[PDB]
Amino acid sequence: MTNIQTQLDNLRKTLRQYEYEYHVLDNPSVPDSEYDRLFHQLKALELEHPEFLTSDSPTQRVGAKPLSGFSQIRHEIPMLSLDNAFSDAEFNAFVKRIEDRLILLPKPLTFCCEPKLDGLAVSILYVNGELTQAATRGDGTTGEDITANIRTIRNVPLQLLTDNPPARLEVRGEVFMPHAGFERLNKYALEHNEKTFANPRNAAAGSLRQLDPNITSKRPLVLNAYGIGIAEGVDLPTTHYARLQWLKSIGIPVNPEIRLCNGADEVLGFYRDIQNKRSSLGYDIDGTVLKINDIALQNELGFISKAPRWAIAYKFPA
Amino acid sequence: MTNIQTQLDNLRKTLRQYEYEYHVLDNPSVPDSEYDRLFHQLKALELEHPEFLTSDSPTQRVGAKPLSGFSQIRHEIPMLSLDNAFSDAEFNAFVKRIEDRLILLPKPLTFCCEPKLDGLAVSILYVNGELTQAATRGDGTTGEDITANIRTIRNVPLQLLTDNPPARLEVRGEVFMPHAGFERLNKYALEHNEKTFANPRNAAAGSLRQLDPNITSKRPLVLNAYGIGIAEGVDLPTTHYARLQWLKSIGIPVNPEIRLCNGADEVLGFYRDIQNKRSSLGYDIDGTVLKINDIALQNELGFISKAPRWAIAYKFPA
Ligand SMILES: Cc1ccc(Cn2cc(C(N)=O)ccc2=O)c(C)c1
Ligand SMILES: Cc1ccc(Cn2cc(C(N)=O)ccc2=O)c(C)c1
Ligand SMILES: COc1ccc(O)c2nc(C)c(C)nc12
Ligand SMILES: COc1ccc(O)c2nc(C)c(C)nc12
Numbered sequence: 001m002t003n004i005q006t007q008l009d010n011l012r013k014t015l016r017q018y019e020y021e022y023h024v025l026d027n028p029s030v031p032d033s034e035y036d037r038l039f040h041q042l043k044a045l046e047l048e049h050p051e052f053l054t055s056d057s058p059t060q061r062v063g064a065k066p067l068s069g070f071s072q073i074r075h076e077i078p079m080l081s082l083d084n085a086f087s088d089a090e091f092n093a094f095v096k097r098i099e100d101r102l103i104l105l106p107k108p109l110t111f112c113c114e115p116k117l118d119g120l121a122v123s124i125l126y127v128n129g130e131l132t133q134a135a136t137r138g139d140g141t142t143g144e145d146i147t148a149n150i151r152t153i154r155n156v157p158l159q160l161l162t163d164n165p166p167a168r169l170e171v172r173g174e175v176f177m178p179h180a181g182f183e184r185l186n187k188y189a190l191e192h193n194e195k196t197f198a199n200p201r202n203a204a205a206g207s208l209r210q211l212d213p214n215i216t217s218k219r220p221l222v223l224n225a226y227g228i229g230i231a232e233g234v235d236l237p238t239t240h241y242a243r244l245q246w247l248k249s250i251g252i253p254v255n256p257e258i259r260l261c262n263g264a265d266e267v268l269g270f271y272r273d274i275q276n277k278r279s280s281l282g283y284d285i286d287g288t289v290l291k292i293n294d295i296a297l298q299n300e301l302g303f304i305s306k307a308p309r310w311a312i313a314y315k316f317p318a
Numbered sequence: 319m320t321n322i323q324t325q326l327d328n329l330r331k332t333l334r335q336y337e338y339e340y341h342v343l344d345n346p347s348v349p350d351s352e353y354d355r356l357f358h359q360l361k362a363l364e365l366e367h368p369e370f371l372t373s374d375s376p377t378q379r380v381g382a383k384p385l386s387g388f389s390q391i392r393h394e395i396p397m398l399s400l401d402n403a404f405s406d407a408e409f410n411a412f413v414k415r416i417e418d419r420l421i422l423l424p425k426p427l428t429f430c431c432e433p434k435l436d437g438l439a440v441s442i443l444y445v446n447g448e449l450t451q452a453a454t455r456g457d458g459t460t461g462e463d464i465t466a467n468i469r470t471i472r473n474v475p476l477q478l479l480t481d482n483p484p485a486r487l488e489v490r491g492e493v494f495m496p497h498a499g500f501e502r503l504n505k506y507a508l509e510h511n512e513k514t515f516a517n518p519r520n521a522a523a524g525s526l527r528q529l530d531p532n533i534t535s536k537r538p539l540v541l542n543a544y545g546i547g548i549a550e551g552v553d554l555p556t557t558h559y560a561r562l563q564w565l566k567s568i569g570i571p572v573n574p575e576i577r578l579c580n581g582a583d584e585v586l587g588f589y590r591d592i593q594n595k596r597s598s599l600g601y602d603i604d605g606t607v608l609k610i611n612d613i614a615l616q617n618e619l620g621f622i623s624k625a626p627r628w629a630i631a632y633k634f635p636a
Contacts, residue, residue, distance in 0.1 A: 081623035085632040086419065093415035094630055100408040101627070116631050140624060271632055278634070287633035291626075301627040305399035306458060308609075309419070309619040312412055313434050314403040314589055315605035316596070 004045065005052050011042040015058045016159065016251075023155035024253050056130045056158040063148045066212035070144040073135040077170070077229045079123060080140060080303060082289065088268060091290075095264045098292070101301060108262040110293040112240040113270045114226070115257050118201045118284040119174030120208055123229055124150060129165030131158050136208070149208055150175075152217040161251030170229030171252050177204040178283045181220025200284050225252045226289070239293050257281075260293060322363065323370050329360040333376045334477065334569075341473035342571050374448045374476040381466045384530035388462040391453040395488070395547045397441060398458060398621060400607065406586060409608075413582045416610070419619060426580040428611040430558040431588045432544070433575050436519045436602040437492030438526055441547055442468060447483030449476050454526070467526055468493075470535040479569030488547030489570050495522040496601045499538025518602050543570045544607070557611050575599075578611060 018035045022028040028035070043059040046052065054060070085091040099105050121137035134150035136143040150156055153175070160169070177185075177200040185203060186196045197203035207219035225247050228236065237243050241260055248254045257274065261267040271288050278285060292298050336353045340346040346353070361377040364370065372378070403409040417423050439455035452468035454461040468474055471493070478487070495503075495518040503521060504514045515521035525537035543565050546554065555561050559578055566572045575592065579585040589606050596603060610616050 078624065081625045082629060082631045083622055083625050083627075085630050086635070090415060090418040091630065091632050093411050093418065097408060097411035097415065098627070100405055100411065116633070275634060285634075287631055289629065289631050292628040298626070298628040303624060303626050304401055304622065305624050306396065306621060307399045307401050308616070308621050309401075309416070310610040310616040311400060311607065312403050312409065313400045313605055313607050314409050315434070316593060316603075317404070 116287045119176035129160040157251040167233030172227040173225035437494035447478040475569040485551030490545040491543035
């Protein structure tokens with residue numbers, strides 16, 4: 001044991017706690033100046049004592065050497081697409097189809113309702129708590145290595161916030177750029193002759209495709225986790241909301257506007273409440289993503305492969 | 319010009335006409351003995367005058383040398399999957415979802431209704447009328463070269479029945495084995511010590527995976543074309559039924575039980591009529607495949623990629 005290895009560990013633990021509070025809780029216990037005082041106190045010391053520097057330290061978010069092309073990554077568990085509804089009557093028909101397709105319909109049919117961010121789908125792996133690999137969605141089967149670019153996102157933890165993290169946990173989420181960040185960026189490109197971005201979706205996509213993390217660092221990107229992929233060494237809850245609540249408690253950013261709605265009548269109330277809030281969110285939203293909250297019912301219903309909406313195989317019973 | 323090149327052309331034209339009548343029309347103009355008389359009259363002569371032998375002659379269906387492993391084939395146009403319904407109430411919900419999803423709902427909503435064969439999905443290419451390539455469905459993106467095995471199917475034309483065939487036409491269909499053929503096959507395996515087949519679906523799959531066409535030739539397989547892929551040099555009709563009627567007129571086998579039904583009430587009548595006929599068809603059927611007959615409405619509705627049945631992105635209007 002030494003006083004400096006004790007100081008480094010203390011600073012790291014504090015700075016991660018301050019980052020959880022600022023980014024995930026939206027409730028920092030200290031001013032930004034305090035957070036920064038300790039940030040460069042740590043950074044200075046790691047450089048004065050290189051032997052005690054760790055790859056997941058809050059000061060090592062940015063890789064100094066720019067990359068020379070992205071590498072392909074075959075996703076273990078596939079990244080699926082989403083079905084879409086464009087009306088109250090169309091949404092109610094999708095529910096009635098599930099109501100019959102199920103073996104037993106519970107009296108309250110609970111749904112985890114969330115806003116649909118206009119963002120880029122990614123998959124982030126965490127091995128024994130620390131971030132080792134990040135990748136784009138791509139076609140769903142294959143994507144690209146955006147690890148050094150995901151590492152630069154201030155609200156993405158480099159280390160999960162738990163003493164017993166799982167063996168391997170894949171966090172699935174959408175990268176996006178909020179309005180303030182988007183407006184600040186286009187002023188800078190205008191003040192320093194360079195291309196401006198059309199809308200926040202394109203700025204985020206363009207920032208993620210950068211091969212120099214130092215550019216990405218300057219881009220004001222943000223993550224919001226929507227699901228889970230690989231889950232080794234853990235017993236994930238039996239509802240989607242609770243799995244989301246669980247990610248929030250281990251250090252991952254999740255959208256605060258997520259709610260549970262019992263049946264289509266309540267779900268339509270949520271869709272309407274978010275449609276009026278569109279004007280005061282601080283980020284873009286295409287709509288609402290609605291999901292069957294019970295995971296057993298999700299595994300009962302299942303998926304549907306690339307297939308027409310104009311054809312159906314109405315099968316016979318035994 | 320010579321009398322023998324004139325004889326060969328005449329025999330080929332006649333034998334193809336007799337095959338259309340026997341296999342596609344189910345109405346042969348002559349007895350099987352007449353068809354066979356001419357078959358080996360042609361075969362004998364092609365062998366007495368090898369120089370005038372063609373690769374698409376009715377006598378060259380079977381390749382004499384067995385293959386040494388199948389080659390992979392990347393499908394140009396993808397081969398999609400099918401959605402499924404398990405009840406009257408579930409089917410009506412799928413219709414109501416289409417009724418709203420469309421911009422304009424026609425008064426009569428016509429559907430091309432057909433029986434669902436329990437068969438193996440294939441893709442057959444015809445270049446300037448003659449059969450050049452056949453392939454399995456596989457994952458949808460990639461399949462296997464079963465050209466020499468498809469060539470052996472008595473009801474699959476080696477040459478389209480038209481003086482102006484299209485540039486490239488991909489016929490999409492299901493290979494299956496009828497009951498008589500299936501019962502005759504298992505008696506032969508029992509009488510000559512070999513594995514029997516569980517049901518017609520497995521016998522057909524096992525026959526298609528043979529690398530020696532001579533085995534496939536002996537297996538009593540059959541094709542029924544359900545759709546079209548590549549379509550160069552032709553203006554395909556604006557309805558699914560008419561495209562099917564068109565395949566029937568150029569020499570391809572299509573199921574005779576296919577009918578047009580106006581609206582869900584009539585479609586349910588068809589589903590019921592086929593459910594009672596199950597007992598007297600002479601081949602297996604899992605159910606009924608129902609399709610929106612108008613091709614414009616098909617291109618309006620579109621497809622849906624690998625995606626959950628338990629989730630939906632209810633988007634906002636402009
Ligand atoms: C100078 C400076 C330092 C830090 C921040 C934001 N911030 C604050 C905290 C905090 N308050 O605990 C934690 C992480 C973080 O990213 C800004 C905007 C500017
Ligand atoms: C001996 C023999 C010859 C032909 C057939 C069946 N058949 C008949 C015709 C025909 N009638 O025009 C055309 C093609 C064909 O496949 C069988 C069952 C047995
Ligand atoms: C970018 O795509 C999405 C966004 C938000 C979601 O909740 C998603 N939920 C699921 C299940 C899937 C496949 N995609 C999602
Ligand atoms: C073996 O799969 C099928 C069988 C019958 C059909 O009509 C099909 N119709 C379509 C459009 C598709 C994608 N698959 C089909």
